[PDB]
Write a protein that binds this ligand. Structure first.
Ligand SMILES: CC(C)(O)c1cc(F)c2c(c1)C(=O)N(Cc1ccc(Cl)cn1)[C@@]2(OCC1(CO)CC1)c1ccc(Cl)cc1
Length: 92
């Protein structure tokens, strides 16, 4: 565990462009737990194939709405606090 369970289980309200992202992979609500936000972001990453076999822990999000929301061209899936911070930038 990198992120406490209690923080994972908290209800959050995505800002509009993060909501657009979640809705594009079937999410149907205005509020989600952080763990659910992460699940749908994962579904989005795998759908858009924002990954590469040469560097299997890196999300390659340049030239993608996800990159614009997170403010980076790529990031490591191992860096959970950094990911949470990037998601907090995108919550109401
Ligand atoms: C191939 C690659 C690059 O290694 C890869 C892509 C990917 F999409 C995910 C992982 C790995 C991974 O371990 N995940 C889980 C995770 C990681 C970090 C945090 Cl803080 C929370 N959860 C990702 O989601 C995995 C799902 C949904 O649980 C099945 C689709 C995931 C979710 C969300 C984000 Cl923002 C980033 C990665």
């Amino acid at each position: 565990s990198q992120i406490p369970a209690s923080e994972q289980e908290t209800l959050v309200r995505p800002k509009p462009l993060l909501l657009k992202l979640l809705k594009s992979v079937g999410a149907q609500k205005d509020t989600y737990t952080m763990k659910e936000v992460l699940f749908y972001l994962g579904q989005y990453i795998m759908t858009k194939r924002l990954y590469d076999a040469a560097q299997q822990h890196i999300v390659y999000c340049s030239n993608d709405l996800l990159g614009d929301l997170f403010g980076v061209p790529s990031f490591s899936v191992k860096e959970h606090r950094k990911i949470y911070t990037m998601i907090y930038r995108n919550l109401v």
